[PDB]
Symmetry: C3
Subunit: 150 residues, 3 copies
Amino acid sequence: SLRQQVEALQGQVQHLQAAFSQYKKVELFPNGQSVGEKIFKTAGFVKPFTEAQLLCTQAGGQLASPRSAAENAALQQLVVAKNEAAFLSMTDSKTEGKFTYPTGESLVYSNWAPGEPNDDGGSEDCVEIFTNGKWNDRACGEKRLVVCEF
Amino acid sequence: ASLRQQVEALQGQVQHLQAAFSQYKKVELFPNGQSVGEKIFKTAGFVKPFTEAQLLCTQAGGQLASPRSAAENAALQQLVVAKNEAAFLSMTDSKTEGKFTYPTGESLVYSNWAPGEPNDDGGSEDCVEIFTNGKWNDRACGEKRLVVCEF
Amino acid sequence: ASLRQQVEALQGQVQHLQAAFSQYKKVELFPNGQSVGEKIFKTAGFVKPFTEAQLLCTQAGGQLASPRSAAENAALQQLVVAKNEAAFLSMTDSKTEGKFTYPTGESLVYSNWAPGEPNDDGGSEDCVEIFTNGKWNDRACGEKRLVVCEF
Ligand SMILES: O=P([O-])([O-])O[C@@H]1[C@H](O)[C@H](O)[C@@H](O)[C@H](O)[C@H]1O
Ligand SMILES: O=P([O-])([O-])O[C@@H]1[C@H](O)[C@H](O)[C@@H](O)[C@H](O)[C@H]1O
Ligand SMILES: [Ca+2]
Ligand SMILES: [Ca+2]
Ligand SMILES: [Ca+2]
Ligand SMILES: [Ca+2]
Ligand SMILES: [Ca+2]
Ligand SMILES: [Ca+2]
Ligand SMILES: [Ca+2]
Ligand SMILES: [Ca+2]
Ligand SMILES: [Ca+2]
């Protein structure tokens, strides 16, 4: 009576494990990347920073925020796949020359291209990631690939 | 006894799936879905005439967007705004002019008509579109609108 | 007794998880996937040459579309019709000319060749495309076709 109910529940949970694992692969193809506990997903279109940031937040995530080389490499795969540089979440909008996450926390990882960040024209407060994975500071009003993290 | 061991094992398995799946729900709905209550809207991201749109949703195991409250209507409008394209709703007055019904044939429980609508303009508007401002307008079914299904 | 309350609780949780998962699965497949039996096809929605397409699917944990029955073929055909783009299948006769095999090296168990196919045209066609009518043609692997993976 119990041992039988438990057997049935075991069957249900085993099915769910199999079905969920299949579904994860389907979901991530072709626009997602799983790295550790984080998932990057591209919207597959470009927006200016403010609009990109709102899209991610409204979706219950935030803009791509790579915090290690492995996360950066995973994000880089999407950028390469779409062949479009992407916005990161980080900006020095508050204090010029100091890049912060959306929390106001200072950077725990960076991958700046040589000579960057350079605030070119005195007006680069957002960050793009190139197909080579390197970062450049860029004007926030430019349109870049939208990639959120969950 | 061994029935207890199995339970605590299962509890761990269900907790893992619950956590893992919660993350995937958010990932899935970005950028083309909107959850509202127990309903999920999902856009195909392109336009079709009504008959084609209706068939796409039905074959996918759902139906055309059928907002049944202000909340559902606002959630749908978010997609329409995001895509910048008016969308078809499920409801028509094809059977009885002036009487809009769901695919089931049930009368409307909610509507958000723009002022003066529905007006059966030209004597030939039996479908319904939702605009970027959330308001509804009867429109010819042969026109192409954003395909948004509900599941 | 307490164990019974726990089994009861966990089963309600699992059944709620089952229902939510089933809903999210329908949403996931619309409009770029098709489920048939235990298999799921999903298109990337762009074209690539065969080697590039095959790598995309392998890297994603699946393989190129490999229809093994009329039912599987028909499900795949829906996606091809939807995108209006012929797709590559997984199968090649690269090893032994005229002998098409799955990635494992197994001989075909099902085929749906268009009349006169496979013909190895130019004496150089070792990949397989599926047309919008669901029929197959051998095609040079260097050509670009719709990417559809199976999982
Ligand atoms: O404006 P532009 O000379 O085409 O491009 C700039 C340069 O590549 C510069 O090295 C970089 O630091 C700037 O962020 C870019 O805007
Ligand atoms: O076709 P059109 O004359 O540009 O526009 C019409 C008008 O906007 C009318 O107010 C509305 O009720 C009709 O549904 C539309 O078709
Ligand atoms: Ca500044
Ligand atoms: Ca700056
Ligand atoms: Ca710069
Ligand atoms: Ca009429
Ligand atoms: Ca009418
Ligand atoms: Ca009207
Ligand atoms: Ca050959
Ligand atoms: Ca050949
Ligand atoms: Ca041929």
